[PDB]
Design a protein around this ligand. Structure first.
Ligand code: NAG
Ligand code: NAG
Ligand code: NAG
Lengths: 681, 198
């Protein structure tokens, strides 16, 4: 299942971002340490053989770059707020030693000084000069770009590194372009999908005859058409955190299909201007917006313009496709209705979250108005939030063994969220009507939560899962599932007759659910969760998890069964379900589930999981966009749609031939033998 | 859903193997049953057996049209007298065969609405729980095959004691057939023929 297509189907890119520091290595002298992508809590430190793109290892360490210095080598780092310092070995990143008493020593890292020693670029062309006898050995043309020489090693395993363009980077040796790298892809904020695709009666009789007879006048298992028919061939347009858009191929290991540079200086969001998937609108951090024409050729910036007010933007929320509206939330908490272009009562409700509260908003008459507010109190802080993703409907009720039905709860206007309060040590879960503000459910847990480990929430078809870390059961990661049913009674459709009732959510005469909840014990700390999909919500929805280590794992929905039983009382307990898998709170980790089998996949501090639908419903794409990009083809149930990659068709064919030969043996024999022997002619 | 071109490697083999397996089954069953004689034993026992058969057919055949000749026989009479394996073997074995080689697919879409408990059994390959009423796995097509295949076999062309006391029992029947029934023929034939052939 995995060994056949282990590295073939999995598709990883590693990004470092624009270099800030590079330090040669104490041993393996064709190797350095690469420092990149600073952030206010941490930075990216890695080890790298210079003569390739071969990254040896990477780590996110929780220090601003300035702390990271050589010894008096041994790469000493010292926290400045406290006196905490870490001594890490360069060759293998071993934490040589720690202390808080005193830093061992420091040496601020030296500047390049490459000019006047080894460098001269005179006829628009570079020449490496020996310090004495400046014979201009190893001269090389300047490319169209040149920003800097990152690094140069004069020793026997010679290596030279150039920041040729802003995002293109070239390695050289004794000139010859030796390898090539691209780090425009280092942080993506928002994403969008583009697919590729192929390309009276009497007369009808004959023209059909002629064209098809011309057609009429062995298997060969070709892969390329299979990919496009099932939607696997796709263009992913990714927007960087910087200003850059580009098309990445979902096949062919993500060769860059095309790259466009903006002038927006940071990207926030992406939107197709219409359903045609031909023209994007892309938003600046600064308050511009660009309109870009996606074509099989390289794009063109068909418009740039300001917004109505040149203010900094926090985010954008997609309003209607047909009405071509968008809502922009500016920092300073200012909301702007957005009528972008023609793209060449009837209320709308839109709802946004902050750590201060959950608010809700309503649009009418080309204006936005607050519809209500819900802020947590001072000590409190909203932590985790999710809305209801829309769903195409298959089954209105979950059945029982004796063809009895529980009518899973389908109300579309729901969101769920968390509150954590200090000293109470109370993770409170609410399942709120996102329109009105009624709560419908409270569930607290005075189980000594941490508030320091990640917690997250995902909203399913009829069920919700949120996860947290806590101690009082045990110090272990905890998944909590709540499943929402119209009536906990075995057979009841509570107030859901639909012939013409036409219920109103705005008024609040809707049904209210009953719920059943359970939780489970999980080995590893969970960063973030989402849900697999296809076009039709058919398969088990296959919760995908992203862990602290970077690992991804999917577990099916079915193992997380509320109304499960501890399996002593299930044994021919006819009423439960069809093949009810038991409750089984201890979910051990099964490495067969894991994607990124041996890949590292450093996702960075802020990353997202998305589920991209495809055709061929056994298969779904799940993509991890953020600091690093990664995707896969994932099967919830194991592949049922695909015929196989691994039939023993030869055994089947040979067995059929065994049938034919035994026919050839017996038929003349038995017909002659029995007819003539029993007649005794 | 979108199933992908396995219609070659399953649907045709399933019908094909059913056709060949049944044709072989008829050949094999016909081969297995061979008499080739009644026996090889002495003359006498079959001889008086066919005498007994002559009495038996006299009950049916000669006991109808012999109004004058009924009694003349009876003096003579008293003095002279005195596959389930084919079900079990192939189809159960190939239930195992199909579940062995063909599993874990949704092979086709039946045209008709079943009930839910039909959808309980048929899809043991797949491990979804709310898939649909109509879709079915590979083994269901087999389940439809076995009961529907009689026209195919027609259209290719195929087609289907005590030694003495029992003698005394049929001698008791020789006594019974004296006047148990004296059948009304050679009396009504004029009535019957004039009733017909007009
Ligand atoms: C270091 O990287 C270079 C470049 O590909 C490679 O040839 C060399 O084998 C690497 N070092 C080791 C010990 O493999
Ligand atoms: C040093 O440790 C303190 C203690 O929590 C921490 O707040 C601070 O962020 C650390 N220094 C840096 C540069 O992160
Ligand atoms: C830098 O710009 C040039 C000119 O547009 C283009 O080839 C590419 O974007 C970069 N070139 C190199 C060699 O990195």
């Amino acid at each position: 299942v995995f060994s056949d297509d282990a590295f073939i189907t999995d598709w990883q890119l590693a990004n470092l971002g624009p270099w800030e520091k590079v330090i040669p290595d104490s041993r393996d002298r064709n190797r350095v340490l690469i420092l990149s992508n600073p952030t206010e809590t941490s930075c990216l430190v890695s080890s790298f053989n210079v003569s390739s793109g071969q990254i040896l290892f990477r780590n996110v360490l929780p220090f601003t770059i300035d702390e990271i210095q050589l010894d008096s080598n041994a790469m000493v780092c010292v926290n400045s707020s406290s006196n905490h310092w870490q001594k890490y070995d360069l060759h293998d990143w071993f934490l040589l030693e720690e202390g808080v008493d005193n830093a061992p020593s420091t040496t601020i890292l030296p500047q390049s000084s490459y000019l006047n020693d080894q460098v001269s670029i005179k006829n628009n062309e570079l020449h490496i000069l020996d310090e004495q006898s400046k014979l201009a050995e190893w001269k090389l043309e300047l490319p169209q770009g040149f920003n800097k020489v990152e690094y140069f090693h004069r020793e026997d395993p010679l290596a030279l590194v150039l920041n040729v363009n802003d995002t293109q980077y070239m390695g050289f040796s004794a000139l010859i372009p030796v390898w090539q790298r691209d780090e425009w892809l280092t942080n993506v904020v928002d994403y969008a999908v583009l697919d590729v695709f192929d390309s009276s009666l009497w007369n009808a009789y004959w023209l059909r005859l002629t064209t098809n007879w011309n057609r009429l006048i062995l298997d060969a298992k070709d892969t390329t058409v299979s990919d496009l028919k099932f939607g696997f061939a796709k263009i992913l347009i990714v927007l960087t955190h910087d200003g850059f858009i580009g098309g990445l191929d979902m096949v062919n290991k993500g060769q860059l299909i095309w790259k466009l540079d903006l002038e927006i200086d940071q990207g926030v969001k992406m939107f197709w201007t219409d359903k045609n998937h031909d023209e994007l609108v892309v938003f600046s951090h600064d308050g511009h917006y660009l309109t870009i024409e996606v074509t099989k050729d390289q794009p063109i910036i068909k418009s740039r313009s300001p917004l109505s007010e040149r203010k900094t933007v926090d985010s954008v929320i997609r309003l209607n496709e047909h009405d071509h509206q968008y809502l922009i939330k500016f920092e300073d908490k200012d909301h702007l209705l957005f009528k972008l272009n023609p793209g060449k009562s009837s209320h709308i409700f839109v709802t946004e979250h902050d750590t201060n509260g959950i608010y809700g908003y309503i649009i009418e008459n080309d204006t936005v108005k607050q519809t209500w507010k819900k802020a947590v109190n001072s000590k409190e802080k909203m932590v985790a939030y999710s809305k209801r993703e829309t769903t195409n409907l298959n089954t209105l009720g979950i059945t029982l063994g004796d063809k009895s039905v529980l009518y899973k709860y389908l109300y579309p206007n729901l969101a769920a969220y968390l509150i954590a309060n200090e000293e109470h040590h109370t993770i409170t879960f609410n399942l709120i009507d996102t329109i009105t503000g009624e709560i419908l459910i409270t569930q607290e847990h005075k189980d000594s939560p941490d508030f320091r480990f990640p917690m997250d929430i995902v909203f399913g078809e009829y069920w919700v899962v949120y996860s947290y870390f806590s101690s009082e059961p045990v110090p272990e990661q905890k998944l909590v599932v709540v499943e929402l049913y119209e009536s906990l009674t075995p057979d009841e459709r509570l107030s859901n007759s639909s012939d013409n009732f036409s219920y109103d959510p705005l008024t609040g005469h809707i049904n209210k659910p009953q719920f059943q909840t359970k939780q489970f014990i999980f080995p590893e700390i969970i960063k973030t969760m989402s849900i697999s999909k296809t076009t039709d919500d058919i398969t088990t929805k296959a919760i995908v998890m992203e862990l602290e280590n970077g690992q991804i794992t999917y577990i099916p929905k079915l193992l997380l069964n509320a109304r499960g039983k501890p399996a002593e009382e299930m044994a021919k307990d006819k009423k439960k379900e069809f093949m009810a898998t038991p409750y089984t709170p201890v979910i051990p980790i099964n490495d067969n589930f894991i994607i990124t089998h041996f890949r590292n996949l450093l996702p960075g501090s802020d990353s997202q999981l998305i589920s991209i639908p495809t055709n061929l419903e056994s298969t779904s794409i799940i993509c991890d966009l953020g600091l690093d990009v990664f995707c896969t083809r994932i099967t919830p149930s194991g592949q049922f749609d695909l015929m196989s990659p691994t039939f023993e068709k030869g055994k089947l064919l040979i067995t059929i031939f065994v049938l034919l030969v035994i026919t050839y043996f017996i038929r003349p024999s038995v017909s002659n033998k029995k007819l003539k022997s029993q007649w005794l002619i | 859903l979108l199933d992908d071109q396995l219609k070659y490697w399953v649907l045709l083999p399933i019908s094909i193997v059913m056709v060949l397996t049944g044709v072989l089954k008829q050949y094999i069953m016909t081969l297995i049953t061979g008499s080739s004689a009644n026996e090889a034993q002495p003359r006498v026992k079959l001889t008086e057996w066919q005498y007994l058969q002559w009495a038996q057919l006299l009950i049916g055949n000669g006991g109808n049209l012999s109004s004058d000749a009924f009694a003349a026989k009876k003096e003579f009479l008293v003095k002279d007298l005195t596959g389930n394996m084919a079900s079990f073997i192939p189809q159960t074995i190939i239930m195992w065969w199909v579940n062995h080689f063909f599993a874990g697919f949704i092979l086709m879409q039946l045209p008709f609405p079943l009930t839910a408990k039909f959808k309980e059994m048929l899809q043991t390959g797949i491990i979804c729980q709310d898939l649909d009423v109509r879709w079915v796995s590979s083994i269901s097509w087999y389940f439809i095959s076995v009961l529907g295949l009689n026209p195919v076999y027609n259209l290719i062309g195929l087609n289907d004691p005590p030694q003495s006391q029992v003698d005394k029992a049929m001698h008791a029947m020789a006594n019974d057939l004296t006047i148990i029934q004296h059948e009304t023929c050679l009396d009504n034939v004029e009535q019957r023929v004039l009733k017909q052939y007009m």
